[PDB]
Design a protein around this ligand. Structure first.
Ligand code: SF4
Ligand code: SF4
Ligand code: SF4
Ligand code: FES
Lengths: 13, 123, 123, 210, 79, 57, 694
């Protein structure tokens, strides 16, 4: 009843 | 200035690696007292790698820096600076920022505005 | 305590620099003469010439000290160290405080340039 | 009684200053405690006068120590405590000493004093010129530093562990599993006590004119 | 390439360099259009010209000198 | 002797993350992590006593 | 003009007409209070500062009793000590037992003061018990528990007077008085998380985080904010790896104890989406890497692409250290390319006003000088959004004195009262020629004030021509003792980048770069970089700017480094590092110092003091901290800034757009924080709760 690291996303060139 | 870093028994790295800081403590914005804002605090700027890190078993804030919880209190800025360069440290004096005097009247709370009122007090 | 201990002397403060120079001179003679006793006494691995060149290089460290009274405290501390070392008061793990660079090489990657400092952010 | 007695102690100390004007700078009393404020080259004659006079025979060193205020140019103040077991009285004697200059030792007079003097030496680095067996006591033999001194941290610089390799204990720079957390940061921001009244008798504060 | 110089706003030891930058900048920017100039001040300094060439290699000269034309000579010998 | 965190009758943890036991301990044995849930009530994510250094005062 | 009197036997001299609490503060006499504040109006609600005054029957309120000559003030009368015990006892009878669960544990003003003056014992042991006064919602930024309120009116005095949001109020009489909006509507002002460090009890506190650390556990650290252009003073509170909060340290000139909303609640983005390792792009997906892997990848791609000159673009961004910009600029200019630009659109050119003569791009009258202003006009800006503390200064001045505002740009909602002038540079020139060549010429201390959202525009130079010609013509806006051409910035770096000379040349704007450097640089577009470019990012958290990158390099944010920052006024100010960079982030200039070694550039320094000396060599008003100097060259600088853009560009009829589409989401931390992500949609003023009517 009662510093998370950034996830990798490389975008398009 | 007699160089006392060789007599106090401190290691060399405490005199030739770390920078230290003179500051007067600011007045807290939360509460309106001013008692802790008269003495001059001598405190060490942190080091990059050896400040603090989380332990793996419980999550204890283990440190490697050993001057992290030391502070000093001096009476004046001149005593603090003479002690700081007598022990052979590199300081940074941070000058205090006081408040500006401005005359207050309770009769400021109502005056006859001749044009737009532009404001409504509530009290 | 009426009588003193064996090799002690009454700590007394010279008013001139030449008398202090004579006293530090006699002091280096005492360390250098007692250096064969320390290898037998503290059971060190290494040779008597390394003890002697260390005593020399520990007086190299304070060769260019100008102030008289800092030379005075430095003499008093050196005589206290002789006093502890010539007897069996220090043990063989505090006698080897003096030789940390000799006993073992800790491993690879002693950083020299900024890059080797910086790959493990100044260690 | 007690008001009369503290007013009597004031007058006794006024006499002690008037008997030796060359050596005694000040005196202060606070609640049946008498402190004599003495220069460092002025230690030995005042202590002989405290041992030797019949009005003033203290005979017995109890405890001596230093205290550092780093905010003063003469850093340490060396305080002496005596006990006249005849007159049933206590007296206190404060001098001063920088890290590098001495104070002279009273171990020629007081036989118990030398052990106290080397204790305050190790805790503070304060010198006692004229002292046989000045060296450290109640710290480590190879210990570098003076512990009871405000630049020295709490946990110190070094720590001890058994290295397997050298088959001996080794001395290493400090690493903690739990860092020290002082809670002094978080004291009161209002003044906690007032100035307080005085216990000065009417005879020993300066007259107002008319 | 750049050139920078520094004065103090006090009327001592920087007044001729100050009178130089009050007047000669509209001609110095036209005489060297491709470079960039920049003037700064810090309430007391020694007056000094820094100019950077085609490497990042920069040179310096100290302008404790009495008249405007001498300041122009030091800058001209610097370039 | 050894410590214990009590509970209420009808089953409730009773430590309200008020942080007094950590601030008083003369040997700094307590270590508490406190977090608040949606409910508005206060509890402790992580409670901890080091018994190598608790001194039983 | 002054008055000598007696307080507690001390004698003290204070200016005439002041309050007696200011004389007691001047003499050193500690007087307790609950509803008095240095920056707010005087009310006599709280009844604590009662003081014994000769020739007075009753003890008078020392906060609103004015100073008269021959005054004998006693504070240690037994009647006064009885009075303080009495009033404290009255305060503490239906205040609720909340100190184990209250926010202000060790920071409660009421609690510290119930020791020095409060009664020992409490008699309230009545059956029917406490008042309740159940609470109400305010917004997603201010937690509200109105049971603990003591009705000191200080929150509503603030939101009326300085914040300019009159929604708060006091509704009731007697025991059923409540504080706050009772429509259940949303308190919107752009400086709104400021009422919680103002309330002396824990009634209004932080909503976005529950407090996790009691204030005796906290480690206080005195740093500078870099999110806004004012460079306001904060106070970082840290448990030791994480950062708990920021609180305004007081400064006399720049912020006067008030801090921005975005300044305060964006410590959430400091711990949620950071960079803790370097990454290398493999193709459609990054992998994390060895440090040497990424930093040799950069050198190998420099040898492969080989930009000989004017092909190494080095764009910086919003919140970056001066020392990191110096490191980058040194590395580019020893590389052989001053393609050294800033992040703003139309950043590829010189910003149509001189890097020369620092008074071109600074805020030239001081921030203190706005209090002395007479009639000022803003162009191309919204000071409510950009530099929100500046609006508190504007409204304070406009309310205390007689001022005249008019505005050229988008139709803004200020707290204060603007006059509209238009949406066109033609409307600008018509307004400067028509009626304000009387107003600004008449005024003793005006100032003309300029946004940096016009440097955004490509037609900027024709917009500088009209205004610089007007300042050169009019001798009241520009004379000896103060300069009144003023601009704003939007960053902590763009006012300090121009101190270094961080600007591209006219030759550098023409080429297309092969190797693009992003340093921060968060608002770049997909069109701003080429398709073949080597696009290495150096920042502290993941963003749009890191999404384009081939290599990302984790840098330390503003909390984790001791950095120099320059505001619009020109103050050089240092921050103090509160905690270390988490995981594998490093300091910003040292990363450039090591990437230089893998290139051919040996940067001449390796120590922070040598950074300070090199930083003095660029300009020595940056190793001199928190001093403001005047300029004797302002007269020359206005003419030198006028001559350049004369005839260089035609003023088109493009209407004056808003500079930022949102306040709450910019500068690469507020995009990552969920506090801003819900505070942007809660304050959209589409809903009925933000609007004053209906
Ligand atoms: S956290 Fe500790 S002090 Fe607080 S209620 Fe729980 S046990 Fe008691
Ligand atoms: S604000 Fe009131 S209830 Fe909360 S801790 Fe302070 S005195 Fe107690
Ligand atoms: S809401 Fe807070 S600041 Fe406002 S009157 Fe109530 S307790 Fe005071
Ligand atoms: S502060 Fe003076 S009575 Fe409220």
């Amino acid at each position: 009843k009662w510093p998370a690291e950034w996830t990798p996303k490389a975008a398009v060139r | 200035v007699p160089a006392h870093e060789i007599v106090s028994g401190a290691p060399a790295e405490l005199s030739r690696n770390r920078v230290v800081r003179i500051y007067q403590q600011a007045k807290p914005a939360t509460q309106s007292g001013e008692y802790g804002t008269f003495a001059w605090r001598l405190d060490w700027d942190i080091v990059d790698v050896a400040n603090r890190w989380e332990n793996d078993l419980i999550g204890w804030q283990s440190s490697g820096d050993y001057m992290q919880a030391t502070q000093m209190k001096f009476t004046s800025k001149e005593s603090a600076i003479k002690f700081a360069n007598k022990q052979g440290w590199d300081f940074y004096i941070q000058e205090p920022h006081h408040r500006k005097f401005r005359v207050k009247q309770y009769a400021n709370n109502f005056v006859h505005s001749y044009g737009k009122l532009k404001h409504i007090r509530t009290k | 305590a009426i009588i003193a201990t064996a090799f002690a002397e009454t700590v007394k403060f010279s008013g001139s620099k030449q008398e202090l120079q004579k006293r530090t001179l006699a002091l280096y003679r005492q360390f250098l003469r007692g250096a064969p006793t320390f290898a037998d006494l503290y059971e060190v691995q290494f040779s008597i010439p390394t003890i002697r060149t260390k005593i020399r290089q520990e007086f190299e460290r304070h060769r260019f000290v100008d102030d008289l009274s800092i030379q005075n405290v430095l003499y008093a501390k050196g005589h206290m160290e002789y006093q502890e070392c010539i007897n069996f008061w220090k043990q063989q793990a505090q006698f080897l405080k003096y030789f940390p660079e000799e006993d073992d090489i800790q491993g690879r990657h002693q950083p020299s340039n900024f890059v080797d400092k910086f790959l493990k952010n100044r260690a | 009684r007690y008001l009369q007695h503290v007013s009597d102690l004031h007058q006794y100390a006024k006499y002690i200053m008037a008997a030796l004007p060359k050596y005694i700078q000040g005196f202060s009393v606070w609640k049946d405690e008498l402190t004599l404020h003495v220069a460092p080259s002025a230690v030995i004659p005042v202590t002989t006068f405290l041992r030797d006079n019949t009005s003033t025979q203290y005979k017995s060193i109890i405890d001596i120590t230093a205290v550092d205020y780093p905010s003063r140019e003469n850093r340490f103040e060396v305080v002496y405590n005596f006990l006249s077991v005849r007159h049933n009285s206590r007296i206190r004697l404060k001098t001063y000493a920088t890290e590098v200059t001495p104070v002279p030792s009273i171990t020629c007079l007081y036989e118990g004093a030398n052990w106290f003097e080397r204790e305050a030496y190790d805790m503070y680095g304060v010198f006692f010129e004229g002292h046989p067996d000045l060296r450290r006591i109640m710290t480590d033999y190879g210990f570098e530093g003076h512990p009871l001194r405000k630049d020295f941290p709490l946990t110190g610089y070094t720590e001890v562990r058994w290295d397997e390799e050298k088959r001996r204990v080794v001395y290493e720079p400090l690493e903690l599993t739990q860092a020290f957390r002082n809670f002094s940061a978080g004291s009161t921001a209002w003044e906690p006590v007032g100035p307080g009244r005085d216990d000065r008798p009417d005879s020993f504060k300066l007259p107002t004119p008319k | 390439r750049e050139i920078r110089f520094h004065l103090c706003q006090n009327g001592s030891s920087s007044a001729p360099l100050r009178q130089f930058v009050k007047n000669q900048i509209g001609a110095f920017q036209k005489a060297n259009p491709s470079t960039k100039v920049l003037v700064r001040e810090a309430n007391g300094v020694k007056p000094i010209v820094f100019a950077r060439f085609d490497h990042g290699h920069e040179s310096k000269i100290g302008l404790d000198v009495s008249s405007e034309k001498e300041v122009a000579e030091r800058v001209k010998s610097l370039i | 002797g050894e410590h214990a965190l009590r509970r209420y009758p009808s089953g409730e943890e009773r430590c309200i993350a008020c942080k007094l036991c950590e601030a008083i301990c003369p040997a700094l044995a307590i270590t508490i992590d406190a977090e608040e849930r949606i409910d508005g009530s206060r509890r402790t994510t992580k409670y901890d006593i080091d018994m190598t250094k608790c001194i039983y005062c | 003009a002054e008055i000598e009197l007696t307080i507690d036997g001390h004698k003290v001299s204070i200016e005439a007409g002041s309050a007696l609490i200011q004389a007691c503060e001047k003499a050193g006499v500690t007087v307790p209070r609950y509803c008095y504040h240095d920056k707010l109006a005087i009310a006599g609600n709280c009844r604590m500062c009662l003081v014994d005054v000769e020739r007075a029957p009753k003890p008078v309120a020392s906060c609103a009793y004015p100073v008269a000559p021959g005054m004998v003030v006693r504070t240690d009368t037994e009647r006064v000590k009885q009075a303080r015990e009495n009033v404290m006892e009255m305060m503490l009878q239906n205040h609720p037992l909340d100190c184990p669960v209250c926010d202000q544990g060790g920071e409660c003003d009421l609690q510290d003061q119930s020791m020095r003056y409060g009664r020992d014992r409490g008699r309230f042991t009545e059956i029917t018990g406490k008042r309740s006064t159940e609470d109400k919602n305010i917004g997603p930024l201010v937690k509200t528990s109105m049971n603990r309120c003591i009705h000191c009116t200080r929150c509503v005095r603030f939101a009326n007077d300085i914040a300019g949001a009159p929604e708060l109020g006091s509704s009731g009489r007697g025991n059923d008085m409540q504080i706050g909006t009772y429509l259940e509507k949303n308190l919107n002002t752009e400086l709104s998380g400021n009422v919680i460090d103002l309330c002396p009890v824990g009634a209004l506190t932080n909503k976005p985080y529950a407090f996790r650390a009691r204030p005796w556990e906290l480690k206080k650290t005195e740093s500078i904010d870099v999110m806004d252009a004012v460079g306001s003073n904060i106070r970082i509170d840290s448990k030791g790896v994480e950062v708990m909060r920021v609180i305004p340290r007081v400064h006399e000139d720049v912020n006067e104890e008030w801090i921005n909303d975005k300044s305060r609640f964006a410590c959430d983005g400091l711990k949620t989406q950071r960079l803790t390792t370097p990454l290398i792009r493999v193709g459609d997906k990054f992998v994390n890497a060895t440090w040497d892997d990424a930093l040799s990848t950069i050198a190998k791609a420099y040898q492969q692409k080989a930009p000989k000159g004017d092909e190494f673009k080095a764009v910086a961004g919003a919140l970056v250290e001066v020392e990191s910009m110096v490191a980058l600029k040194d590395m580019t200019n020893a590389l052989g390319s001053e393609n050294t630009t800033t992040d703003t659109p139309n950043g590829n050119s010189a910003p149509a006003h001189g890097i020369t003569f620092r008074s071109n791009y600074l805020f030239n009258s001081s921030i203190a000088g706005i209090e002395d202003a007479d009639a000022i006009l803003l162009v191309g800006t919204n000071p409510r959004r950009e530099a929100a503390v500046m609006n508190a200064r504007i409204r304070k001045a406009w309310l205390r004195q007689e001022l005249e505002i008019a505005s050229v740009g988008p139709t803004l909602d200020a707290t204060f009262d603007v006059a509209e002038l238009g949406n066109t540079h033609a409307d600008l020139e018509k307004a400067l020629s028509g009626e304000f060549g009387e107003v600004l010429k008449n005024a003793k201390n005006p100032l003309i004030i300029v946004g940096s959202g016009i440097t955004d525009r490509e037609d900027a130079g024709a917009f500088f021509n009209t205004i610089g010609k007007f300042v050169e013509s009019t001798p009241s806006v520009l004379n000896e003792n103060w300069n009144g051409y003023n601009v704003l910035q939007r960053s902590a770096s763009r006012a300090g980048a121009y101190d270094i000379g961080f600007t591209p040349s006219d030759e550098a704007s023409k080429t297309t770069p092969k190797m693009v450097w992003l340093l921060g640089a968060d608002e770049v577009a997909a069109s701003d970089i080429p398709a073949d470019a080597f696009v290495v990012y150096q920042g502290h958290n993941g963003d749009v700017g890191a999404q384009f990158a081939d290599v990302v390099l984790p840098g330390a944010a503003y909390t984790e480094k001791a950095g120099t920052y320059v505001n619009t006024e020109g103050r050089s100010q240092i921050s103090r590092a509160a905690t270390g960079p988490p995981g594998g982030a490093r300091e910003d200039w040292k990363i450039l110092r090591a990437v230089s070694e893998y290139l051919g550039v040996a940067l001449p320094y390796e120590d922070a003091y040598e950074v300070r000396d090199r930083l003095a060599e660029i300009s020595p008003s940056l190793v001199r901290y928190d001093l403001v100097e005047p300029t004797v060259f302002g007269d020359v600088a206005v003419q030198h800034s006028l001559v350049g853009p004369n005839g260089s560009v035609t003023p088109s009829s493009a209407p004056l757009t808003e500079t930022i589409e949102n306040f709450y989401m910019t500068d690469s931390i507020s995009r990552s924080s969920p506090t801003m992500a819900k505070s942007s949609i809660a304050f959209n003023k589409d809903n009925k709760k933000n609007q004053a009517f209906a």
